[PDB]
Amino acid sequence: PNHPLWYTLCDRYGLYVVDEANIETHGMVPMNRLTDDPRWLPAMSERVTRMVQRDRNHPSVIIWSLGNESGHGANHDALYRWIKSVDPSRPVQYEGGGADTTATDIICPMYARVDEDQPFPAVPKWSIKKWLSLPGETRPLILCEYAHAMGNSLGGFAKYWQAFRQYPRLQGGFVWDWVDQSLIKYDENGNPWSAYGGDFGDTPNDAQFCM
Amino acid sequence: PNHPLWYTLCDRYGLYVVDEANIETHGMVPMNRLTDDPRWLPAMSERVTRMVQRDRNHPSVIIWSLGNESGHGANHDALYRWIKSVDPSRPVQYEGGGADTTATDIICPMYARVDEDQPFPAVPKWSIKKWLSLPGETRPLILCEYAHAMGNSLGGFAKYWQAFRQYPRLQGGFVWDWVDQSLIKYDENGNPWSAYGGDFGDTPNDAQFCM
Ligand code: NA
Ligand code: NA
Ligand code: NA
Ligand code: NA
Structure with missing residues (x-):
């Protein structure tokens, strides 16, 4: 998630934004070791839910992103659904696990x-x-x-x-x-x-x- | 439809066959002038139905074709459905009218x-x-x-x-x-x-x- 002013500028100057949760566990082996672990679901969910709660009124934001390079875990599927339920106005994407999984x-x-x-x-x-x-x-x-x-x-x-x-x-x-x-x-x-x-x-x- | 022996040979030697109705009205303007005319539905129906009745037991035939270069008319959709109904064992194809119509x-x-x-x-x-x-x-x-x-x-x-x-x-x-x-x-x-x-x-x- 960016500095708050960035979204205001994008709203005003006009730029489509992909707001992405602060979650990347690239160094793990395999990449989804943490994201597929129910014990990390709480920490991950706050990074997604608090982002949405903060920027959901910005017109510039047209797509929500679950993060970057964290493989594909069940935590992603859970959070993907959370957003679809809370904010059906924006598509949700995520590249991890193959770029075409059930979480995007x-x-x-x-x-x-x-x-x-x-x-x-x-x-x-x-x-x-x-x-x-x-x-x-x-x-x-x-x-x-x-x-x-x-x-x-x-x-x-x-x-x-x-x-x-x-x-x-x-x-x-x-x-x-x-x-x-x-x-x-x-x-x-x-x-x-x-x-x-x-x-x-x-x-x-x-x-x-x-x- | 070909000489009846052709299918027996393709059955035995092993060749996939596309059995095609003897229907082509390429010279009409537009191409579907006759195939969209319910008055020519009877004549067209005989060329399709009698083909299926004669060759439906040949394993070499894997696809039925409604004919060739006759644009796309309502008679095509009707006959396409007739085949799907009497012989669900083989897909039905037809190129007229854009190659991707409702008749293929x-x-x-x-x-x-x-x-x-x-x-x-x-x-x-x-x-x-x-x-x-x-x-x-x-x-x-x-x-x-x-x-x-x-x-x-x-x-x-x-x-x-x-x-x-x-x-x-x-x-x-x-x-x-x-x-x-x-x-x-x-x-x-x-x-x-x-x-x-x-x-x-x-x-x-x-x-x-x-x-
Ligand atoms: Na394009
Ligand atoms: Na780099
Ligand atoms: Na291929
Ligand atoms: Na020729």
Whole structure:
């Protein structure tokens, strides 16, 4: 959940917002170890319910998100239903566990390619055109993350947009991401320079992967 | 419907057959002028019902077809229902009127392309990958006709098969077609030569389009 003023600005300047609960357990093994554990349901539910209770009147918020990279747990299904019950005005999405589980109204993969499949075991990232028509599937597809803009990047960006425009159910996505997470540091001469992972003695760290 | 022996051979050698009613009114303007006329329902009903009564015991027949290029008329919906009722053992397909009407259990376009759309008014030919995911569509897609093998052709054939194998609901198609419809004529020397449209004094005619 963002600083309260962000939603007011989006309401006024006009930007569609996906409000996401502060829940990410990426480092767990497997990713859903905690989210599928009934003992963590209470902590998770407050992160979802208190978000909804705070931002439910903002017109800019058009979609609720259960969080990020926490696999797919029964806690997600429970909280998904909680929202649908409390606020039927907004669709609920969540990418964890395969991007098309029972906890999301929208097929929302991260980095699924336009034409090329990535048949990872359990959590495959199908070509987005193919994903749409898998037997039984009918939901819309909007990538929660795509076109990773790390450094000299965004190659193949036009391929996505040609697809978004030709396929009615391919409704876009959110580029990753807006601003480099670099921090300022000063050399002996007092001159500032852009720093990243490990430049503060922090270790282990993931170097430039924060930009 | 073919010579009765054809089905016996397909039963024994093993070939899946699409048994098609002898109904094509391509030359009408518009194409469904007769098929939407209840006065031609009796004549059309006999061509469909008598086909089913004759061939319903052949295992090789797995799909019934209401005919070809006769647009889409109410007579089609009526006969489609008649078959579903008397023989639920086989799906029913028909391409007229857009290839995805209420008269077909299978999206069966002719010459629809793999990635390229052909947005003709009323009866568009969407790219087959896109056709599958159109809002609300759930049926399987099998081209009743594709890869027109006229003369030096079949360029791009590989493109269809790459698509057929990547998309579960793209289940193939029927190439058009098997054998050139050329006829044997004899020159002065008495040597035989392959003849086509117009070589018999027939006029108007469509020349080599029969091969
Ligand atoms: Na679209
Ligand atoms: Na990163
Ligand atoms: Na297929
Ligand atoms: Na022809």
